[PDB]
Design a protein around this ligand. Sequence first.
Ligand SMILES: Nc1ncnc2c1ncn2[C@@H]1O[C@H](C[C@@H](N)CC[C@H](N)C(=O)O)[C@@H](O)[C@H]1O
Ligand SMILES: Nc1ncnc2c1ncn2[C@@H]1O[C@H](C[C@@H](N)CC[C@H](N)C(=O)O)[C@@H](O)[C@H]1O
Ligand SMILES: Nc1ncnc2c1ncn2[C@@H]1O[C@H](C[C@@H](N)CC[C@H](N)C(=O)O)[C@@H](O)[C@H]1O
Ligand SMILES: *c1cnn(CC(=O)Nc2ccc(C)c(S(N)(=O)=O)c2)c(=O)c1Cl
Ligand SMILES: *c1cnn(CC(=O)Nc2ccc(C)c(S(N)(=O)=O)c2)c(=O)c1Cl
Ligand SMILES: [Cl-]
Ligand SMILES: [Cl-]
Ligand SMILES: [Cl-]
Ligand SMILES: [Cl-]
Ligand SMILES: [Cl-]
Lengths: 318, 621, 621, 295
Amino acid sequence: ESQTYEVFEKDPIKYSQYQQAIYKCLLDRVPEEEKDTNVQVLMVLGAGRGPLVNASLRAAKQADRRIKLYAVEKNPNAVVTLENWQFEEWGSQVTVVSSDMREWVAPEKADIIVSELLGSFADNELSPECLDGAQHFLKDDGVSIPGEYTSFLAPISSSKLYNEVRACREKDRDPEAQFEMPYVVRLHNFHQLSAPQPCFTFSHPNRDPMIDNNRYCTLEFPVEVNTVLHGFAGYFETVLYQDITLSIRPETHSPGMFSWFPILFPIKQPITVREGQTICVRFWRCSNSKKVWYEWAVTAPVCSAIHNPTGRSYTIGL
Amino acid sequence: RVSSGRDLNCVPEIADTLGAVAKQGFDFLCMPVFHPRFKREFIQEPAKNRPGPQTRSDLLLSGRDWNTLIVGKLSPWIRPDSKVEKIRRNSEAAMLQELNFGAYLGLPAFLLPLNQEDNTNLARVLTNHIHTGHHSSMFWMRVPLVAPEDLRDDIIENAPTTHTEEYSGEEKTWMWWHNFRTLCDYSKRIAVALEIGADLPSNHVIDRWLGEPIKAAILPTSIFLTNKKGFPVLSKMHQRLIFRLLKLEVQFIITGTNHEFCSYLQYLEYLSQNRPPPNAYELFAKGYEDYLQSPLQPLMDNLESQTYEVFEKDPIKYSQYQQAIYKCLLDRVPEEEKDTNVQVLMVLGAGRGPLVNASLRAAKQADRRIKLYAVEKNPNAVVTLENWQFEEWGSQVTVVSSDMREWVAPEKADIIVSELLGSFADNELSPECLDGAQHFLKDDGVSIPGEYTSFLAPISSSKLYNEVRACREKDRDPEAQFEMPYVVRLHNFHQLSAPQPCFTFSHPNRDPMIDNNRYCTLEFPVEVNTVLHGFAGYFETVLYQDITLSIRPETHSPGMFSWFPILFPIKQPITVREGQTICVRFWRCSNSKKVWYEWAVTAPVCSAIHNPTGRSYTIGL
Amino acid sequence: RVSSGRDLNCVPEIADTLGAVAKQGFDFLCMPVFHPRFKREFIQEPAKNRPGPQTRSDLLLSGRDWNTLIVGKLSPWIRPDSKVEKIRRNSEAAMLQELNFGAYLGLPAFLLPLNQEDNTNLARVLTNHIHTGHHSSMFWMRVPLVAPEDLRDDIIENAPTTHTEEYSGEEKTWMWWHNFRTLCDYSKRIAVALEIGADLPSNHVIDRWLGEPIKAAILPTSIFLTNKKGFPVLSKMHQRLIFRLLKLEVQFIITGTNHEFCSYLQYLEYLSQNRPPPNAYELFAKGYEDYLQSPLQPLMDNLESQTYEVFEKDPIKYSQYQQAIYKCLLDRVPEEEKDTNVQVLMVLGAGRGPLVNASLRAAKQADRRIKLYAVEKNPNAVVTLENWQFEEWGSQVTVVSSDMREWVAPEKADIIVSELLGSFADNELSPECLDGAQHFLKDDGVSIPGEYTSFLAPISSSKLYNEVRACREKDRDPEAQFEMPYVVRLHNFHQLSAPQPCFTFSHPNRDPMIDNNRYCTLEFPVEVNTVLHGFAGYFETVLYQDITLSIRPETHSPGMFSWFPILFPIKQPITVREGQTICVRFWRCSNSKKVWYEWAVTAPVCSAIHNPTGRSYTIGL
Amino acid sequence: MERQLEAARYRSDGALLLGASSLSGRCWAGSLWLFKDPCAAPNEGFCSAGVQTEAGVADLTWVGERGILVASDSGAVELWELDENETLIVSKFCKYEHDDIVSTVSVLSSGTQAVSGSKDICIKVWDLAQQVVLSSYRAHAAQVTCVAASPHKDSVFLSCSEDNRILLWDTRCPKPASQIPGYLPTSLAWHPQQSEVFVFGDENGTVSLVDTKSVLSSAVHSQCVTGLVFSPHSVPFLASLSEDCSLAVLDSSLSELFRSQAHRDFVRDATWSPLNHSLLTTVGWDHQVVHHVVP
Ligand SMILES: Nc1ncnc2c1ncn2[C@@H]1O[C@H](C[C@@H](N)CC[C@H](N)C(=O)O)[C@@H](O)[C@H]1O
Ligand SMILES: Nc1ncnc2c1ncn2[C@@H]1O[C@H](C[C@@H](N)CC[C@H](N)C(=O)O)[C@@H](O)[C@H]1O
Ligand SMILES: Nc1ncnc2c1ncn2[C@@H]1O[C@H](C[C@@H](N)CC[C@H](N)C(=O)O)[C@@H](O)[C@H]1O
Ligand SMILES: *c1cnn(CC(=O)Nc2ccc(C)c(S(N)(=O)=O)c2)c(=O)c1Cl
Ligand SMILES: *c1cnn(CC(=O)Nc2ccc(C)c(S(N)(=O)=O)c2)c(=O)c1Cl
Ligand SMILES: [Cl-]
Ligand SMILES: [Cl-]
Ligand SMILES: [Cl-]
Ligand SMILES: [Cl-]
Ligand SMILES: [Cl-]
């Protein structure tokens, strides 16, 4: 909706970080002698209502380099905003494309592809599948901003959140589907039981003959306290360009960035954990041609059921 | 008849192999559905594009032969939990391919191994296949009694075998299974194929497997010794284990090379022939093994004609009631008063009349005079009583169509005879009914039964846990099935501690305040590692002095099949370690309209209180 | 074998009566469970306190005899809809008492009469008994084809019988039943016992009873005429009605006095012996009458081996495909080019190979040369194809393990042969698959099938309505069962109007925009009063020119049992009067991942739109 | 002949022994073939001798000049011997001692005894003349992948298994095996000159050089190292073959000299010609017999 994008646009840190990553990339790709003759093709993939298009233009005027911009957006309602801003302000410098990244046939290859397709668990909005589909129109030496992202998990104790998840039982569905799906939540009344550890990582552009976005990850969490495990908190880190990054990992959280709250993967049954015991968690990233989903299971100190087998309770539509 | 299959890894020609296997006397064949050495690539070229066919055709056997004679096997190279990513991914693809081929063929079962501790990814690929379609076919998890690392010869000089005792380590293989079936969420389609070795483990290791869904026992040819005659036989230790597996009606699988096969099968048939035959109880109970039933409520509901006929088939119950009445008449009327003293006997809940007849046989045995009243609230049973009273009993018996608690008696009773007991003694509301009929018993009068006591014992049964969970039904709480008792002939289970007394009631109740509410705490020492799934309930009753009835297994009245045990389940299974104490709390609760039980486990871990306020289960007054 | 029972109101001795009834050849006995004249008081004294027994004992027959040989009857004096309050209250108490006694005895069925228009209170007392326990026993509502007031002799001078035509009035007895079963909320336990009279009503009155749960037909002895020989027989008009009732497998009940009984039964056995025997279709369909099945989805799901074997049992389907291919080869290759022109044939969705074999038989019949490609996405079916290609076909056939829509062909096709049709033609997604395989058909190439059309027809079936409603399941919308099609061999129903064409697709699709979405309005004239419960769906396909396949009942291909009709149900039954038009709207909808149907009735009354957005039912792309 | 060629071994004179199985289709049997003209292989009409075996050939070796020892899918170890004219392969023994597929056979230095390994987890030492099992050893905890007899010490042999153990055996000791936590070991080869040196291949494509008294390692393949065969030269080369479908030839420091991607399916065995020491033959599941000119 319109008011969701307005909320995305209220974040000053996210865009100033994207501007800086673009600015650095233009200086490294075009030397001062080529400045006024070399026009870099920039493609904003999932342009929304235009804040990354504006950040790319501010980055080009900051870098003092020339750019040709394409704003690709599949949401037709957001395209109305883009096409009006293109007539009233941008002009011919920006060409608005009303399309899906993965279906669009580009008139020329890109030097840089700029996107902001990340969720609170990095790849949960399907940034890997979208960017793989837009890859072929990036020229062979081209850069993707972001170039990389990594998700993190940390076991948590929260009898309040356990009870809030359980409260989400609803008619006409599995009586425990609420425990088999992630929630975005500003986690408050909880206990982080162990330091967050990296779960899945994706790199762009993906240069590998076989491209498989499926993952399987085992994490061992030492707990130095007696407690009850109720779920796992999820966070992420992204490398936009070289040293320009974004993070919601609490230890390295980008200051003043409120675009993403953590995610919570719950467990159906609370698991007792004694001081000295290790919480072992298994996470899977699964997919088919139509859906992407996660499965998870606790294997130590006690086994849980595998949560969300076959995406029965939760999927992310392709 | 013992149902046996042949296990093979080598099948040159499927039709020739199946025939030889049938000629040897086997009922089925476990064989690979793809050649066990034919490893397949799914990602990398050029091997990925290997020309087919990938295996032999479904057309080589009939649909019925695939459906009834073939058990499929996972290829040995399939390792979904490999540490090499490439192996793990080809193994995931190959495992789905082989399982989908078994589904295509309509195989009744498929064998998968549990031969290491970490099978998380194997479980994840199986779970996903189980949630793809709607099939009934079984997955038999091939797990050894003893892990292969704990069975190896002590012949590695710089890596000796552990010589000390590891109580929990000798049962590591049960934890391999327990974890696999916990990740797969107790699927009804996942069962155990127990692989038995030459050297059996300690009794505690075998005991773990009690109450587990064992569907097959794999016997290697190497465990068979040769007798003087030349025929194959087993040690007394293995014969003992085979007899316990025959009670569970598992299928036997012969694996390994011949060291003439129908000979190994004739040995198993001889063992099956030579064992205690089914007794009167076990013949009645045939078919009811672990069948969950709702306990009868004779007060709230009117029993059908065929329920009373089943009650009447029990010869022990009535001969015990006759004897209790006989003893009571002799003690109440001395030989000098014999022909002048007429004792007023009231059968309270007479049904179709078997206790009325037992009272008359007791009076003629005792040689005493009695005036009988047959009180029965079920009007349909009163039709039987009133016809029997006209045709046979006459004026000696007066039939009363009434509720015990509402009836206004013409005279006080000397003796009140009732059979209002359930499998947990007081669960059919014998205390409330007899309290209401008490006022018309004369001050020195006797109640038969005079007393009854219920007992509980913790149990482990992954089969029954799963059968209770299966009872989820629409338009009710999604966990109401775990908050109610079931009458069940308990079979595939492990009693974790001796039964202990729970609630006791005495009749007549001589106390100013009469409160039938109870609260009981029981502490059960467990001498084994296990998983608690519920509590078995039994009872004992004193009919009169030394005449008793019991379904408590240690004192079970011989040949009495009127009551099977009751099971109080728990929503969540509770892990219990050797040495830990299971602490259970039971409440008997009531109001003016309903009676119910609540229960909770408090040690080693707390459970929720089950059936708060009778929300899932009540017994109507 | 015709299953017959004797109906009696007079049973002096139950055992003597049942034996005479068995000796006459009857399978069961309908008799009173209380004496029909023994009227009972439940409120007023002194009659209220009448000494018992109230009826004969359950002990006079075995449990099995009560359970299998006895149909109970309500006492004739029981009138729950009496205008006298006292009669209505004793009748409510007596009706519950008699019904509870039948439940006690374990009777398989009980007879209740519908012999007047207002049975609201009878329905209320029956409904309450049905919601007391959990039983399977049946209530057979005894209703006449002709009301007794409309059957009386015209012998009352000051009250003559109506001589005019009352179309709706001649079918008043169906409304008596319709209302009773509507108040009882279509209970599965309430069925019809149709009482047939000497003078049958008009055909429309008999036709009302189409699609109603008739379980028994009551034939009075007075409707039987005597032939020259002296044996009992029926008029051609009654024989016709008996033959329609034999298709519904009802039980026959002989009532009234003998005017030697096994003679009336031998007549019925002779009629059952002398009628058209079951054809190839009716022998295959045996057991599947009104069995609701989910339609197969061969695109989204991989079919099992035994599903393809069942597809292959159809001799007509393939001989029709062979003939269509044969005709196409002769028309595409002239006799002079015969040995030089090799036509590229592509079987799209080859399964286990029966269309590949039909294409080879067609080429040898036509005496033309062909290059074959067998494309199949199911990998399990590809194992069959690749083995058949090695052992038999050779290089003439190249097997492709692929999806039609993804495959990159080495050369263009002359002919594309497919069998991707469902019972509603396009419900297995033949349009989307063939559109995706179109580009590799050469510009003048042919598709077999070239065309297919679906048809709908409104139906009345209270049995199927109730079978659909029974499909409610936990964890889903409580009415999703009414928002999805079922494959069903429709049996106990009434087709209310001729089938009309719904959607048509043509192959190859030569149109710049290819939209497989459809919207269709159909107007169905109904010439009868009735209740609409859903729409039957059928199809027709043009394979090539005059070679066709059809399951449309008016043009059904003889002996073809590959497709049963489909049923699109409606959540709420819709009343339709004679002369009214049923207006139905059908939509074929889709997105990039799913295809589905929506439907709505707009005349004579609106329904809800069924399956909005594919919420209850989709067909995976 | 069956599609899946499993073994290729040259004898002294230069005749090529081939072992094959049908790992798919209707019949899952195997066969042995002798080619006195190796360039004619795998053509059946231009072979010297050939026979069909009951089941598939998991592995084989030459026992002298006449004998052929076979590791069968049936659980049998079979000995076949050539005719006096070398135009017939005839069975001498078929002993069913393993309870699962016999995955590997190796003739001990004396030429009179053999070691077999299996999926039944056992290692059996055989007396080839008596046609009996001398000893049976359950040292591993999972299926045995490879057994390699010492070239010159008759009581010494290596074995490896899925339990992640490489065992050095000396049958003269009371506890005859000893262990030598990486990736699973999958192939073994003793050095032809250094009696205390051996190479091993792992499931991750790495080839490692080991000294039994006391290392060198290299990432040669992108999949399981199926086999390791030393050349007959003074300073030998090492032929490495994998499920990645390639063949590599390495020097004494495990650095790559040659590479062939000729095979379209898994490479199963490699054999160096005794006549031309730069000629290396390989077979695979693609039914190809390839002759490589190795620099
Ligand atoms: N495959 C796709 N092709 C085109 N646009 C897409 C695709 N997937 C997602 N999007 C759009 O990408 C945007 C992702 C948003 N989370 C970010 C909005 C915007 N770039 C901002 O920073 O305000 C939305 O506007 C989506 O509709
Ligand atoms: N309060 C009550 N007043 C009268 N009868 C009762 C009452 N509660 C239960 N009953 C009857 O007592 C009987 C209990 C049965 N379990 C035993 C039947 C019978 N005495 C026998 O041994 O075969 C049933 O026939 C009940 O209907
Ligand atoms: N898009 C597709 N590409 C390839 N095969 C398909 C596709 N959709 C369906 N099929 C196959 O087409 C077949 C359709 C069947 N109803 C007919 C089977 C077979 N032709 C017969 O007449 O016995 C199945 O074997 C499907 O798996
Ligand atoms: C196949 C089938 N049956 N027999 C008979 C057989 O094996 N009998 C048998 C089995 C076990 C034992 C212990 C004995 S006994 N009572 O003599 O000790 C006999 C076969 O011989 C074949 Cl080949
Ligand atoms: C009892 C049973 N069976 N029969 C024979 C009988 O009634 N046969 C019979 C019935 C009907 C008809 C129309 C004819 S026919 N073909 O001769 O017209 C014969 C009995 O006689 C008794 Cl009593
Ligand atoms: Cl903007
Ligand atoms: Cl289940
Ligand atoms: Cl009796
Ligand atoms: Cl119902
Ligand atoms: Cl076929």
